[PDB]
Amino acid sequence: VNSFSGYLKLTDNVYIKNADIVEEAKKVKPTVVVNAANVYLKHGGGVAGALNKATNNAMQVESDDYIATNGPLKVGGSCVLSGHNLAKHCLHVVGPNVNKGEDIQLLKSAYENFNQHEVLLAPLLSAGIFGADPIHSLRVCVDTVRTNVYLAVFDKNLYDKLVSSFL
């Protein structure tokens, strides 16, 4: 039993809700929140900008030190950093950016990072400004993640479309 509330069940392990991930994180304070990061951990907009803003820029300060030490992440890769005031940990995951020509096949690699954590609050990856189709991203999520994932979908119209077309 966990404290996530109001989710629709898609499969044994995947749950979905029309919600702002920032609000879900503040309310639930989960063990792991997933950020839809870029390789530079520059949290400018979308999920990352909103999460970082909610930490009063502490996420960005921590991230800049991470990059100065370790260099950029790989597309498809991840790192575990603090969740600040939103969660115990933040799993920063880089999906491919199709508007940059990056291989959409790397989206499966991105979701594989979720399997290192028993339970996560997450967005779909590679959608938003990363350019990919959210319907495809959900299929990859369901077919890749085996741990318990609670998906927060910001746009109500998209949520309704994802849950009406789900196979």
Ligand SMILES: CC[C@@H](O)[C@H]1CCCN1c1ncnc2[nH]ccc12
């Ligand atoms: C389908 C993927 C989409 O849901 C992602 C990509 C764009 C923004 N978005 C968000 N998701 C959840 N919570 C959010 N809070 C602020 C933004 C946001």
Ligand SMILES: [Cl-]
């Ligand atoms: Cl985004």
